[model samples]
Target: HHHHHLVPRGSNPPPPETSNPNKPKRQTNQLQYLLRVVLKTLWKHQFAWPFQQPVDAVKLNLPDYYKIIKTPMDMGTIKKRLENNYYWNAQECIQDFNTMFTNCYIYNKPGDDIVLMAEALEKLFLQKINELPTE
Candidate 1:
């Protein structure tokens, strides 16, 4: 039998800015104003949930695992919970989710919530962007 092994590399170019360049930068000082409008608006309808009460209307799949990340939960908390579940590889977990979140940005509109979510998701994927193998 032949086996393949994955080797981790370091110091690669920044992850592809997979989302829209027009997205707002976090340093712009309009973070809260943007996210408030963004989340509130995109989640304005509960048709997406179909079951839950749609309190916030933001539904990240893998609720039991990702709910901790809803509403900007700290990385440390994410780590503690993931680690307790034996998920030690930060790149494996955060990188995929980050890409998914980034791709979500492109499909989304130029609203406050969209931009804010992109910024938050960008920070999470920065480390593995370059090293990741894209299709």
Candidate 2:
């Protein structure tokens, strides 16, 4: 025969867990990761033709992907460098641009800039690749 007690018995609630404020937040996001993948593919294919010296601005036509990158002086300097044949040759200019762009999107405050811009450019790159009629 078993006896039943009126009061609940035995188990006590577990101690509340504490969070550490010093822990660093996770830096990379999915969109930034995707951007890295695209960048890798782009670089692999020399999509921007970074290896080629003295890039012809007329031939390159500056894809929308380049436009998406955030840079100092609104990318005017790159365009100017291209037009004037300044210190930055095509590869150097594109390298600088891509570096700045990557840093801007990946190493920044949490916001829509990374996600939205990356998504837009990803779509744009794909669309541009599929389109015909360009030299």
Candidate 3:
């Protein structure tokens, strides 16, 4: 078996100009860039609408949403975590994405529109990760 390890030998790049507030998130590393693209592609899909933000149970009239789903997740949350570098490793990020997909599958019945979207995203997510193997 062989592994492709990241070599840390680069000099730091110039300081970011996001201090002006046009675009803030910086591409710090290749892993971050790869994962950011994954998140970006997901958010780019039409099916991503339902998952862009958390479900507002009160407005949706499903007050039991939080009760049934212990771990509430959304695209925005994942984006925040990504920009903030909250993930210790890539695996945790995968787990969070899987959790988000799982929650959709659990809360919505199979064959439902939302479930179908999640399924689509799930397939896309897997393909992206498979194309990007760690070991």
Candidate 4:
């Protein structure tokens, strides 16, 4: 499965946004928890490991891989990119993830943790898209 999208089986909805500063945390939403799980896993990768210790790994002829990593963005640029109504959206982010995940000779298959990470990334991007509320 290329660009696999895996939602946890029988997941619950995300928690409602609340403003009560003193509210005790109750049972968290499964979907939101999944999002956090995915996000944390993805964020932990500095991607330095891939470039590290390349002892003719390419010559192994196992694969020719180009990491389709996003360029690091400044906070302002990241904020603006997500809030730009004409361009940014959940669908667009999903598509971008799909493209990058499958491109540049990278592996694309279900159960591959990298693909799972990409799917998680797509879900996490929804938070960024939701940040821009209508007046």
User: In model 1, which runs have C-alpha deviations exceeding 4 angstroms?
Assistant: 1-80, 124-135
Best by TM-score: 3
lDDT of 2 by residue, 13-78 (tens): 231112234532232332232234433344444233332222222354533333343332213333
In angstroms, how far off is 4's CA in candidate 1? 57
C-alpha TM-scores of all predictions: 0.28, 0.31, 0.73, 0.30
- In model 2, what lDDT does residue 59 have? 51
Error of 2 at 73 (Å): 7.0
Residue pairs whose backbone atoms clash in candidate 4: none
For candidate 1, which ten residues in a row score worst on lDDT?
48-57
Q: For model 1, how does the per-residue alpha-carbon lDDT over 1-135 read when each residue is reduced to its tens digit?
A: 445554442222232222344543232212232223322332343322221122222333333333332333223333333323323243434543454454445444676674566565455335424443432
- lDDT at 32, model 4: 37
Those runs of model 2 whose alpha carbons end farther than 4 Å from true positions after fitting are 1-74, 109-111, 118-135
lDDT of each: 0.36, 0.38, 0.71, 0.36
lDDT of 4 by residue, 1-135 (tens): 675665533322232222334533332233233234432443454532222222122453433232322221221222232333222234433343344434312444676654565555545545544543332
Clashing pairs in 1: 38-113
Residues 73-96, model 3: lDDT tens digits: 777677777776665567666777
